[PDB]
Amino acid sequence: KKVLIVYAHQEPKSFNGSLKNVAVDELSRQGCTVTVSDLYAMNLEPRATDKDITGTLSNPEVFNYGVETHEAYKQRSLASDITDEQKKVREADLVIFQFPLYWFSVPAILKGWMDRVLCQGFAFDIPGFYDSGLLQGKLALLSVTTGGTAEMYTKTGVNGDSRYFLWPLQHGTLHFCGFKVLAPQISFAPEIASEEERKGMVAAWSQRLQTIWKEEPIPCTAHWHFG
Amino acid sequence: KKVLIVYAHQEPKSFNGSLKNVAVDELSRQGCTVTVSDLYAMNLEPRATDKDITGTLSNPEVFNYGVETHEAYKQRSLASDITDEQKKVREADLVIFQFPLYWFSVPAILKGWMDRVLCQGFAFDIPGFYDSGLLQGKLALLSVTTGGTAEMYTKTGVNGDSRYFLWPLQHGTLHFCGFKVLAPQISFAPEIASEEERKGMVAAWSQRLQTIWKEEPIPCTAHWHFG
Numbered sequence: 001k002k003v004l005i006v007y008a009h010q011e012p013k014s015f016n017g018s019l020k021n022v023a024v025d026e027l028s029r030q031g032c033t034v035t036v037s038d039l040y041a042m043n044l045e046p047r048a049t050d051k052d053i054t055g056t057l058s059n060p061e062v063f064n065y066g067v068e069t070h071e072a073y074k075q076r077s078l079a080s081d082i083t084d085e086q087k088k089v090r091e092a093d094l095v096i097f098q099f100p101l102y103w104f105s106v107p108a109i110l111k112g113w114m115d116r117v118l119c120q121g122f123a124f125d126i127p128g129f130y131d132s133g134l135l136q137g138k139l140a141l142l143s144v145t146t147g148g149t150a151e152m153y154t155k156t157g158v159n160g161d162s163r164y165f166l167w168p169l170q171h172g173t174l175h176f177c178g179f180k181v182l183a184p185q186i187s188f189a190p191e192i193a194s195e196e197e198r199k200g201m202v203a204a205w206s207q208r209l210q211t212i213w214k215e216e217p218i219p220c221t222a223h224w225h226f227g
Numbered sequence: 228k229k230v231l232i233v234y235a236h237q238e239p240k241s242f243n244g245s246l247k248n249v250a251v252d253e254l255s256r257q258g259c260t261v262t263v264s265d266l267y268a269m270n271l272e273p274r275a276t277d278k279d280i281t282g283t284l285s286n287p288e289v290f291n292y293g294v295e296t297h298e299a300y301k302q303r304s305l306a307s308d309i310t311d312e313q314k315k316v317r318e319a320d321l322v323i324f325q326f327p328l329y330w331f332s333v334p335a336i337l338k339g340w341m342d343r344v345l346c347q348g349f350a351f352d353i354p355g356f357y358d359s360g361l362l363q364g365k366l367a368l369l370s371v372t373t374g375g376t377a378e379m380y381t382k383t384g385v386n387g388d389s390r391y392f393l394w395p396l397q398h399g400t401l402h403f404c405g406f407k408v409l410a411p412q413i414s415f416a417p418e419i420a421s422e423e424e425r426k427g428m429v430a431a432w433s434q435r436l437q438t439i440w441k442e443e444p445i446p447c448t449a450h451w452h453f454g
């Protein structure tokens with residue numbers, strides 16, 4: 001089994017860093033092939049621009065990012081940062097995203113990974129999306145950390161259910177590309193937690209990874225997210 | 228009345244470009260003060276990094292973006308790009324976001340504007356969020372374009388209701404900062420639309436803007452989004 005961890009945190013000593021490292025440790029111990037895309041260390045470009053296409057654009061006068069990247073994918077003329085990520089995704093059986101929640105979503109650097117890597121022709125086609133997406137047969141999992149507490153992320157709490165914010169990521173992105181989605185790993189409020197509680201949350205993640213290949217996906221439906 | 232338009236499209240001749248331009252024209256005609264932050268033209272940095280804090284002689288052993296930006300805000304030592312955006316927001320009565328939908332969310336460059344500009348001390352405090360957010364008394368409005376059709380973005384359509392994807396943006400971001408949220412402007416599927424239909428969608432936005440100051444905000448609730 002091949003695993004790609006797309007990791008989005010600036011600080012190696014962070015709680016996110018520890019969750020990433022325990023995932024490498026545990027998945028490596030199992031004998032999995034593991035790759036980490038450390039986006040901040042890579043200084044990944046997040047902006048969707050004409051620099052993402054090498055050589056001459058299909059229409060140099062009016063720039064249409066979607067058309068140009070779709071054609072570049074077909075012509076093997078995407079920027080090498082993009083194509084390097086695509087190779088990692090193509091080979092992976094499981095893609096784990098490890099990030100702190102920023103504005104009920106992914107940090108911009110990770111949003112940029114999604115925007116630039118998951119291009120038409122690679123991740124989906126028309127037709128060829130949702131269950132027919134081009135990354136069908138693969139698993140994806142969101143491993144998210146929050147400032148807010150679990151109680152705040154309940155239906156009656158100030159933030160609403162955590163599932164509510166997952167919709168654009170799980171349905172709109174991962175399911176759209178054909179992934180099956182494993183239940184999210186949400187590590188609530190590490191700053192509020194004691195050191196030993198944080199150790200427990202890292203241990204919980206490690207333990208979950210021991211049996212990750214036996215899990216069933218979640219149903220990636222509006223009902224799951226909002227019902 | 229002062230308006231800031233935060234605009235995220237690479238191509239001035241785009242449908243998004245036209246929506247931005249009609250907004251400038253209409254609001255300017257009314258006598259409003261209008262500013263546009265053209266993120267791609269500004270080459271706005273989207274990544275949340277230690278470069279966002281100026282005047283650091285020696286790097287801390289552990290970098291905590293949220294703590295460091297909070298402190299930098301209080302010390303007036305944020306990067307000049309951030310500071311300049313904050314001044315525009317501080318003065319604005321209405322903030323319009325004009326963007327194409329990317330993965331059920333904002334383009335990464337706009338996500339980076341949110342991540343970097345809306346820092347603790349400026350947009351919210353702890354406590355001082357949701358109805359006590361620091362941008363209370365201001366209005367915000369999302370003007371979104373999509374590839375998918377209106378019918379796809381219905382409860383029974385493949386993408387679910389358009390309101391579902393608005394939650395992280397409207398509740399988790401804008402309401403969290405204390406904004407009152409005006410109903411979104413969603414211009415569906417301009418590529419599919421005929422030239423006449425496209426002109427109609429631009430005219431509809433301009434027409435709406437004629438009376439924007441008389442609108443009531445939406446109730447920014449789970450019921451509004453998911454009911």
Ligand SMILES: Cc1cc2nc3c(=O)[nH]c(=O)nc-3n(C[C@H](O)[C@H](O)[C@H](O)COP(=O)(O)OP(=O)(O)OC[C@H]3O[C@@H](n4cnc5c(N)ncnc54)[C@H](O)[C@@H]3O)c2cc1C
Nearest residue numbers: 014015016018100101102103104145146147148198199293
């Ligand atoms: C721009 C921005 C937007 C945000 N938006 C949101 C939002 O929408 N919703 C929300 O809820 N929160 C939000 N937050 C808060 C953010 O999600 C949290 O601050 C983040 O998830 C905390 O994770 P961390 O890895 O940075 O924590 P850290 O601060 O690294 O974790 C706390 C401590 O854990 C320690 N630690 C590291 N490894 C271990 C280990 N193995 N065992 C024990 N301790 C360890 C660290 O040393 C550190 O002292 C936002 C923050 C920012 C900056």
Ligand SMILES: Cc1cc2nc3c(=O)[nH]c(=O)nc-3n(C[C@H](O)[C@H](O)[C@H](O)COP(=O)(O)OP(=O)(O)OC[C@H]3O[C@@H](n4cnc5c(N)ncnc54)[C@H](O)[C@@H]3O)c2cc1C
Nearest residue numbers: 066241242243245327328329330331372373374375425426
């Ligand atoms: C990375 C990525 C992710 C995406 N994710 C999603 C998603 O999650 N959901 C989704 O639905 N879509 C998604 N899309 C599609 C994207 O949202 C649409 O392509 C975008 O909204 C179209 O807006 P535009 O301004 O680029 O259109 P354009 O292609 O510029 O507009 C269509 C036509 O309108 C013309 N036009 C411009 N101004 C006028 C005028 N005044 N009058 C008449 N015609 C005019 C233009 O010349 C053009 O021919 C995604 C695209 C990308 C690249």
Ligand SMILES: C1=C/COCc2cc(ccc2OCCN2CCCC2)Nc2nccc(n2)-c2cccc(c2)COC/1
Nearest residue numbers: 103104147148149152159191192293345347353399403
């Ligand atoms: C909760 C806010 C409380 O602070 C959490 C918290 C939050 C941040 C940094 C540290 C931190 O707890 C650091 C630890 N602090 C110790 C006591 C209070 C938390 N920063 C931050 N920045 C932008 C948006 C949000 N949070 C944001 C947006 C929406 C919803 C939330 C956060 C989370 O629910 C609302």
Ligand SMILES: C1=C/COCc2cc(ccc2OCCN2CCCC2)Nc2nccc(n2)-c2cccc(c2)COC/1
Nearest residue numbers: 066118120126172176330331374375376379386418419
């Ligand atoms: C609809 C897919 C149809 O293509 C729309 C469409 C899509 C794109 C570019 C142009 C475009 O219509 C340009 C005009 N097209 C050319 C022929 C007619 C439609 N690109 C794109 N890229 C990444 C993700 C998504 N869309 C994405 C993710 C989730 C949901 C959707 C899109 C939207 O619902 C699913």
Ligand SMILES: [Zn+2]
Nearest residue numbers: 171175220221
């Ligand atoms: Zn789904």
Ligand SMILES: [Zn+2]
Nearest residue numbers: 398402447448
């Ligand atoms: Zn709300």
